[PDB]
Amino acid sequence: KQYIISEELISEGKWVKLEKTTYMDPTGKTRTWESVKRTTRKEQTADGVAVIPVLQRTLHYECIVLVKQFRPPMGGYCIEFPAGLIDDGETPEAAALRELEEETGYKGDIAECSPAVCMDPGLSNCTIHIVTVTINGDDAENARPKPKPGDGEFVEVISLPKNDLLQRLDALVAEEHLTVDARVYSYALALKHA
Amino acid sequence: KQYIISEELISEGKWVKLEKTTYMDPTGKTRTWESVKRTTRKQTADGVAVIPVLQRTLHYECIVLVKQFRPPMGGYCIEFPAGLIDDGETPEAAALRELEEETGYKGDIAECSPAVCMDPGLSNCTIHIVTVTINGDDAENARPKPKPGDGEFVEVISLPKNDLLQRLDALVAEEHLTVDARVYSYALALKHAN
Numbered sequence A: 001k002q003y004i005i006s007e008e009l010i011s012e013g014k015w016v017k018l019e020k021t022t023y024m025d026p027t028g029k030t031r032t033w034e035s036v037k038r039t040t041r042k043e044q045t046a047d048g049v050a051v052i053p054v055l056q057r058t059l060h061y062e063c064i065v066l067v068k069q070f071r072p073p074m075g076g077y078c079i080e081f082p083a084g085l086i087d088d089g090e091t092p093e094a095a096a097l098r099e100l101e102e103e104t105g106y107k108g109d110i111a112e113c114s115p116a117v118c119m120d121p122g123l124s125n126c127t128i129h130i131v132t133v134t135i136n137g138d139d140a141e142n143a144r145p146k147p148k149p150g151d152g153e154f155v156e157v158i159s160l161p162k163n164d165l166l167q168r169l170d171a172l173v174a175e176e177h178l179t180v181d182a183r184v185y186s187y188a189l190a191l192k193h194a
Numbered sequence B: 001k002q003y004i005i006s007e008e009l010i011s012e013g014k015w016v017k018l019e020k021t022t023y024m025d026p027t028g029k030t031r032t033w034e035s036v037k038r039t040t041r042k043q044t045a046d047g048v049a050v051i052p053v054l055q056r057t058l059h060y061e062c063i064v065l066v067k068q069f070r071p072p073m074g075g076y077c078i079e080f081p082a083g084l085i086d087d088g089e090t091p092e093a094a095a096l097r098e099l100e101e102e103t104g105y106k107g108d109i110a111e112c113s114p115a116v117c118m119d120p121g122l123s124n125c126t127i128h129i130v131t132v133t134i135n136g137d138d139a140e141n142a143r144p145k146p147k148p149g150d151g152e153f154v155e156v157i158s159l160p161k162n163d164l165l166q167r168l169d170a171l172v173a174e175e176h177l178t179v180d181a182r183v184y185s186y187a188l189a190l191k192h193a194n
């Protein structure tokens, strides 16, 4: 039934553009939408990755490793899964492993990799791979891990037990002004609901 | 330590605007960001997303999802039922309303998240995630009658909770739909639990 008729550029910055999208509705009528896209997407299967890093150590409960950063669009701090854009020619897995080490200092092992999933599909075309990665916290590589953050990146690491994630995220939200990412919250909720 | 110094409008559509955000980085250096915002926010958040748990006796529990054409994606996406919160609507009420309009089901509130961010490196968009149970053995949920608005065209997809991830992966492979990242994250945590 439905499909894109035309995409007209309305405004283009260095990083994001806004487009007027003309599409065919399933009645047969022509309609429009205001679409956001990134300018950085090349031949990657998605814009970015988000990493679900499960930190595993003998005689410890498993922890989910999360990051806290200032986010300019939000005007504040947010708690999220480690994440970044996929470099040109980089695989989603390499990008996940790389971003996890840069944001946390951990060296992980790939567990699984999702298909490309949409971030906010009524607003933008942005997509990611969700890459699950186990971290062997008994390995010396991962003992006293140093974040190697890039140009103007300033990330704090927060490891929360998987068995109590939702309450621990609620505790954090109770204690400061800070926003939990929707993917992180959805994951915490399903841990509870299981 | 980090904060917003100012926001310059770049472009404002009917629904979405692009801004240039000046902010103070933690080194004490001024930096800029390209930020997307909706023009519709009043509210606690922009929207709600509903996790609708369809409970029918002697059947598997299902998570109720919707499939729609998304103009920004240029394709069909599988998502939790969702929409914008009307000015003066509570998140809980927007959840029950949107769940009804999109699926036909009449549900009960189980819990509601604080405002969580959709894509905080890109936008300030936020939602409340609202867990809702649907008593599928009540008469009002027998022949659920969707009340979809002008220009909305929503197909309902109910998937069993205890196989959700495998079922979604199967839909992506065979139907070439895009699964929403929140849906996928929830699905992943269901498998990752314990």
Ligand SMILES: Cn1cc(Oc2ncncc2Cl)cn1
Pocket (backbone or CB within 6 Å): A032, A033, A034, A035, A122, A123, B015, B016, B038, B040, B084
């Ligand atoms: C029901 N509703 C959906 C809205 O959002 C949009 N609609 C069109 N173009 C872009 C966007 Cl983001 C506003 N109200």
Ligand SMILES: Cn1cc(Oc2ncncc2Cl)cn1
Pocket (backbone or CB within 6 Å): A015, A016, A040, A085, B032, B033, B034, B035, B121, B122
């Ligand atoms: C690492 N990286 C993140 C990027 O995205 C943006 N960067 C600045 N302003 C807005 C956006 Cl969306 C580009 N590269």
Ligand SMILES: [Cl-]
Pocket (backbone or CB within 6 Å): A193, B053, B110, B131, B133
């Ligand atoms: Cl539940």
Ligand SMILES: [Mg+2]
Pocket (backbone or CB within 6 Å): A082, A083, A084, A103
């Ligand atoms: Mg990042």
Ligand SMILES: [Mg+2]
Pocket (backbone or CB within 6 Å): A083, A084, A102, A103, A153
């Ligand atoms: Mg980074």
Ligand SMILES: [Mg+2]
Pocket (backbone or CB within 6 Å): B081, B082, B083, B102
């Ligand atoms: Mg909707």
Ligand SMILES: [Mg+2]
Pocket (backbone or CB within 6 Å): B083, B084, B149
């Ligand atoms: Mg609507």
